[model samples]
Target: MLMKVAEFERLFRQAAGLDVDKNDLKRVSDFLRNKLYDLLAVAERNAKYNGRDLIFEPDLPIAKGLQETLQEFRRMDTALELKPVLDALAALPPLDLEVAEDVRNLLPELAGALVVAYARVLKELDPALKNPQTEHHERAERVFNLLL
Candidate 1:
């Protein structure tokens, strides 16, 4: 609904290098977009809890298939808490932060199966002590602090 199915299928075909169904594409991608928005809603709650004007990656709740990727980056050693995030950011990367609004809406949720795969890699996470996740929150929070 939010995305034009035909266009979605076209992009899907090109990205997939094969695919051949329009209706299936619509149903799946639309479902994915909705679910991603749902995740965004969950993250927005987290942002409000901390009084943030923006939604950062750390606010995402690890979803359906994130176990493996989490393990891979588990030892990256990012910031652990607000204070550590502050401290860790002393290590900063010179990266661009400016993103256009239209471009911003492009991903975060695309094809349910695949988008979820990639999104899981970039979704929100919680701190372990006060929450369930531990490391990603460290990297996310630290990277965020560095930007500011």
Candidate 2:
């Protein structure tokens, strides 16, 4: 798994007061990883278009909502570390252009925003959901598809 299941469980509980199984985490991690890659691909495109060799912060697609989520993630006192996120990113195929220092530093924050958004969406789907089952995960997946 790209992310630690225990850490994800803790983050899920902290964000939505819900419990998740290993399957749920697998889904989340895979989904986030793909989305992150899609982002970097777009960033690479922007960098190439600008005739730059490095992908800058502005090249990344940080939507307004995502930016707000990132800020909120920062305000929450939690630790999800950059190492695992970096590991996950490393597992992906390299891009055409190199990522700038600032963009590289933003990866973890981007990951945090994604987790925060996912957990909050789960809670929003069902306020009384203490344990997320298959149905909850499916709904969240659909929600993610529409947005990300």
Candidate 3:
């Protein structure tokens, strides 16, 4: 089940080892700055005639290649690692850089905390789904053993 924002914040604080809110603020700021940089890159690439209609003929190929590569990567078994999953989750904020800074900045610590919490939630919700061959599953099993 999806958690309320307040519940998410509390759980995030508990999981992320944050003592003060300032550290979270800094992390969020950095995250937003990074996202803005990415968005600006895209906007620049998509700039078009009279700064009104965006036109990108050549860039379409690159975009299609990226989409295909991402699709292939998602199909790969190695993409399930905690680090990759965390990276992907972090990358989500960049989809809307204008508002991303505010949302990400508001919950920097929670963002980091969610990385760990997501793993726990996955294990709890789908313990049997763990693949014995994957490093993530192995690590998860160890964590589960220790926790249980």
Candidate 4:
């Protein structure tokens, strides 16, 4: 069965070999929620800058907190794709101003790509889960765009 947020939390606690406190669960969930939003925002900004619609694709390397969290989750054998993307992101060096501008230019396309990826993953995991909480999505998008 695909895991719900609560179930994922429980599994995470078990994987960590630690007691799952309510506060910790809240914190982790909040963290993931924010990270997801940030990633989406970056992707959206990148897409717009590139004159593309919102869609998250696998081509772009994962970055920031989402990458780190994916790495941690991978240690528990939750997903395989996470590692490669995280690795790709890590391989990139600090961007110069010109490169940064270029990246910023692509933010919207990247954001859209990420959203598509996220939506696909969620759908594959749970087809019934159409249209996740929009508030969270918007928050992530905002956070990510702010980073750019």
lDDT of 1 by residue, 47-109 (tens): 677776666666555443443433332333321122222222223331123223422332222
Scored by TM-score, the top model is 2
- C-alpha displacement of 116 in model 4, angstroms? 22
User: What TM-score, computed on C-alpha atoms, does each candidate reach?
Assistant: 0.38, 0.90, 0.23, 0.39
Worst 10 residues of 2 by lDDT: 1-10
Each model's lDDT: 0.38, 0.82, 0.35, 0.41
lDDT for 78 in candidate 3 is: 23
Clashes (N, CA, C under 3 Å) per candidate:
1, 0, 0, 28
For residues 39-65, write the lDDT of model 4, one tens digit per residue. 445555566667665344432347565
Quote the positional error of residue 77 for candidate 2 in Å: 2.8
Candidate 4 to truth, TM: 0.39
Q: Largest lDDT belongs to which candidate?
A: 2
Alpha-carbon runs more than 4 Å astray in model 1: 1-20, 67-113, 116-148
Tens-place lDDT digits, model 3, residues 22-141: 324334334333433343445434554225343232322234533443344333322122332234345444332232332333233323333333344334645553322234434544
For candidate 2, write residues 42-126 as lDDT tens digits. Answer: 9999999999999998898879998998888888866566778878877788787778889877887778778888889988889
Error of 1 at 13 (Å): 8.6
> Which regions of candidate 3 fall more than 4 Å away from where they truly are?
1-21, 49-148
